[PDB]
Write a structure and sequence with these properties.
The complex is a heterodimer of chains A (about 600) and B (about 200). Chain A is globular, with a radius of gyration of 25 Å. In chain A, the strands form 3 sheets. In chain A, strands 1-2 form a two-stranded antiparallel ribbon. Chain A has a two-stranded parallel ribbon with strand order 3-6. A two-stranded antiparallel ribbon of chain A has the order 4-5. Chain A has one domain. By secondary structure, chain A is mostly helical. Chain B has about 200 residues and is mostly beta strands. Helices cover about 10% and strands about 25% of the residues of chain B. In chain B, the strands form 3 sheets. A 5-stranded antiparallel beta sheet of chain B has the order 1-3-9-4-2. The longest helix of chain B is centred in the first third of the chain and has 5 residues. Chain B is globular. The chains are: A mainly alpha (about 600), B mainly beta (about 200). Chains A and B meet through α1 and α12 of A and loops of B. Bound molecules: 2-acetamido-2-deoxy-beta-D-glucopyranose (4 copies) and zinc ion (ZN). Chain A: This is Angiotensin-converting enzyme 2.
């Protein structure tokens, strides 16, 4: 028997063994997340530890089949994914040091506290304490105190750990034959050996930068309009030509500009579409909300939810003393077990979240027939892109009128359309320079292009130049402001939020064209379009079995990430912004700072 | 008026593992086949050659009842000309099969919280099964070229895998009890008529 035939048999044993071991761990994890007890924490760890130990053993055994002697690509994909050394290419000592470093950075982030001056007992955590300030406060000094204290007390603790974390991560990556840890992260987009669909790791840098250039005009005008509105609210704190102060952006980092809507809303006398009152007026409950979401996917030709979904999910807060982790999550436990965990309230937000979360379930169900290791999104940005387009359609006035929640006597006027697009842009567009700039900095640090004694100097140079945001207090190299965001101190790649954002409008535009939608893209509802559902399903069932370039082409007809649908979605706002900014300065000088 | 002992087959406490499928020879009795096909308790009742509709007007020399447990997605493999782990390694029907295949969901009996591992199936085998063949061997499967020495290790796998039957699995992964009725016709007494 050949090496390939041995690998097929080896993967055969792995799939059947992993399926049950993963199920045991998912089940234990579920019981803790819905019913928080000490016994459930231990059972979650024991099942989780066995699964991790199983993966470590099977990874070593997989490495004894060299990829060079395998021609069947679907075998090579599974073999390669299992074979990845990860941290296990380092010595046990280095591996142990790195794991200690990761846990300490995580613990500092989630337990880091800040106490107000003159009361060392009045202390706030990031969640909910500091986040409440950064999302709701209009007072300049309170916001500045929260922004600086978080970075000066918690960020400074992370600085030495992050320096050592980079060194060990780079050693791990170079031992795995990558250029550095950033090149390792970019490997999620790599495709080899499929003519016409290949994609190199370095090509991601070029494609992110190329598409970001086309985003700059829309962002510049979004930045200029926001700066003008804030300058009306804070005339003594904002320069008409300068960057936006970093603590005046709606959250701790300015990752999203969502919470600037109240001070920037174009037409403040036209109210939002808030369909919550109609839901309560009709006595909707959680089961109705998820039944409606199920009805939505069925209308495009996707299957209804399984019986186990309704029996085993937790669609409401359990309440009295059984405590649960209420963050909305879609669970693929394996063995045909699909569940949603969500503490649903009767609100429009949770109504849209259910469609989003059920979108994940539809994705999970569609690639269930794939081999275990290929049961995932085509790349790191696919799954979240699938979830986002579901809430795009479900939120439109057209869809809310067809399910009886929005009055037929509500008609769209262009002022509510500008209000909605501006609110969307604050979240969706505002995060794109933030996400690209943050990942560029980490890429350059891992690459070795930023020396340690210039980490924060470069971090704020790039914030000013690329994001148009300026720090309100000078920060020397004892700070580690990037690590003050969860994803950096918890070792998660970040470009996924950039690529997913472009993917979702590529998906939505393609699906809406299949749905024969007439009018602006942002008013599209793919409901009742089996043609759209079929086009999406053709990619969903692929899982990870095909190159992500091919999976994308199944939906949109193109092999690569494309920014044009994103600009098509926001075009009505773009023309309105350009007219608004006619007597404003557009762009920013980087040398102005609030500390003069 | 000797009634064929179908109750012992269908209403058994525990079914056999499919790799070790159970065979019950039925002889010298009266079988009321119409009770089964017109009971509406089974999810699969498909006959090949013979007709379920009132063909208890026939006589057969011997009737065999094969029973075992498989997951729902594998019930499709209990049919002539099918491939897959069950059809190739555990239980194989002939191309010219004359008989009926009966299956029902047994999640209420064969699933358990934490997992029921009583039922096994054969995952590896050097070759495919002849029709109506049974392999209950436990020889360690040699996937490579180095001898296994009777223990599992590199490229050496114990050939039988366990279903993990949990009540919360999807329908495709839930246990199903299967009964396969063979109708044999030899130039012989024809002892099972069953009006
Ligand atoms: C919560 O977990 C405990 C064991 O930790 C268990 O005895 C109890 O039945 C569970 N309650 C619910 C509602 O699941
Ligand atoms: C790869 O192997 C699987 C199963 O071993 C088979 O179904 C598939 O056709 C093979 N692909 C190629 C290109 O040989
Ligand atoms: C889903 O639809 C099928 C029909 O295709 C139906 O048989 C089944 O009962 C439905 N299940 C639910 C939970 O709606
Ligand atoms: C199994 O038991 C039920 C209830 O006692 C009975 O109706 C059924 O006929 C039995 N099965 C057979 C094959 O007789
Ligand atoms: Zn999501």
């Amino acid at each position: 028997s050949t090496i390939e035939e041995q690998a097929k048999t080896f993967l055969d044993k792995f799939n059947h063994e992993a399926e049950d071991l993963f199920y045991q761990s998912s089940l234990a994890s579920w019981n803790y997340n819905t019913n928080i007890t000490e016994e459930n924490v231990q059972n979650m760890n024991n099942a989780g530890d066995k699964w991790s130990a199983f993966l470590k053993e099977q990874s070593t055994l997989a490495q004894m089949y060299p990829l060079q002697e395998i021609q069947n690509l679907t075998v090579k994909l599974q073999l390669q994914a299992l074979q990845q050394n990860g941290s296990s290419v380092l010595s046990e000592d280095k591996s142990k040091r790195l794991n200690t470093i990761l846990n300490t950075m995580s613990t500092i982030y989630s337990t880091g506290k800040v106490c107000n001056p003159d009361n060392p007992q009045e202390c706030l955590l990031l969640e909910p304490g500091l986040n409440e300030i950064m999302a709701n406060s209009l007072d300049y000094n309170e916001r500045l105190w929260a922004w600086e204290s978080w970075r000066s007390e918690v960020g400074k603790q992370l600085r030495p750990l992050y320096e050592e974390y980079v060194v060990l991560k780079n050693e791990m990556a170079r031992a795995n034959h990558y250029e550095d840890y950033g090149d390792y992260w970019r490997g999620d987009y790599e495709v080899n050996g499929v003519d016409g669909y290949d994609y190199s790791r370095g090509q991601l840098i070029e494609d992110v930068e190329h598409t970001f250039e086309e985003i700059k005009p829309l962002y510049e005008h979004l930045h200029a309009y926001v700066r003008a509105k804030l300058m009306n609210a804070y005339p003594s704190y904002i320069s008409p030509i300068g960057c936006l102060p970093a603590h005046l952006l709606g959250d701790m980092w300015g990752r999203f500009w969502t919470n600037l809507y109240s001070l920037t809303v174009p037409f403040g006398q036209k109210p939002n579409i808030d369909v919550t009152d109609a839901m309560v007026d009709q006595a909707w409950d959680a089961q109705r909300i998820f039944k409606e979401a199920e009805k939505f996917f069925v209308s495009v030709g996707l299957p209804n939810m399984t019986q186990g979904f309704w029996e085993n999910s937790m669609l409401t807060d359990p309440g009295n003393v059984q405590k649960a982790v209420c963050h909305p999550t879609a669970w693929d436990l394996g063995k045909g077990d699909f569940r949603i965990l969500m503490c649903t309230k009767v609100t429009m937000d949770d109504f849209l979240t259910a469609h989003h979360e059920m979108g994940h379930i539809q994705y999970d169900m569609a690639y269930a027939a794939q081999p275990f290791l290929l049961r995932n999104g085509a790349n790191e940005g696919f799954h979240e892109a699938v979830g986002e387009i579901m809430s795009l359609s479900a939120a439109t006035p057209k869809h809310l009128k067809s399910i009886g929640l929005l009055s037929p006597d509500f008609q769209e006027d262009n002022e509510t359309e500008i209000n909605f697009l501006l609110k969307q842009a604050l979240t969706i567009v505002g995060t794109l320079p933030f996400t690209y700039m943050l990942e560029k900095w980490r890429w350059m640090v891992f690459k070795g292009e930023i020396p340690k004694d210039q980490w924060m100097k470069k971090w704020w140079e790039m914030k000013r130049e690329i994001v148009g945001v300026v720090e309100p207090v000078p920060h020397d190299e004892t700070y580690c402001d990037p690590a003050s965001l969860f994803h950096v101190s918890n070792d998660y790649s970040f470009i996924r939020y950039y690529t997913r954002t472009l993917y979702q409008f590529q998906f939505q535009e393609a699906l809406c064209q299949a749905a024969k939608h007439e009018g602006p893209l942002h008013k599209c509802d793919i409901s009742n379009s089996t043609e759209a559902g079929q086009k999406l399903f053709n990619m969903l069932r692929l899982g990870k079995s095909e190159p992500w370039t091919l999976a994308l082409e199944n939906v949109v007809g193109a092999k690569n990430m494309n920014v044009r649908p994103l600009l098509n979605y926001f075009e009505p706002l773009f023309t309105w912004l350009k007219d608004q900014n006619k007597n404003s300065f557009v762009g920013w000088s980087t040398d102005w700072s609030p500390y003069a | 008026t000797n009634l064929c002992p179908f109750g012992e087959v269908f209403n058994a406490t525990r079914f056999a593992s499919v790799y070790a499928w159970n065979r019950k020879r039925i002889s010298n009795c009266v079988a009321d086949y119409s009770v089964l096909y017109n009971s509406a308790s089974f999810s699969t009742f498909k006959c090949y050659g013979v007709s379920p509709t009132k063909l208890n007007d026939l006589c057969f020399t011997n009737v065999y009842a094969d029973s075992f447990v498989i997951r729902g997605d594998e019930v499709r493999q209990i049919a002539p000309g099918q491939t897959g782990k069950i059809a190739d390694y555990n239980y194989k029907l002939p191309d010219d099969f004359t008989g009926c295949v009966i299956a029902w969901n047994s999640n209420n009996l064969d699933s358990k919280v934490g997992g029921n591992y009583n039922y096994l199936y054969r995952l590896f085998r050097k070759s495919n099964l002849k029709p109506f063949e049974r392999d209950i061997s436990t020889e360690i499967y040699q996937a490579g070229s180095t001898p296994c020495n009777g223990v599992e290790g590199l490229n050496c796998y114990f050939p039988l895998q366990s279903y993990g039957f949990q009540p919360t699995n999807g329908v495709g992964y839930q246990p199903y009890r299967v009964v396969v009725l063979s109708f044999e016709l030899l130039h012989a007494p024809a002892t099972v008529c069953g009006p």
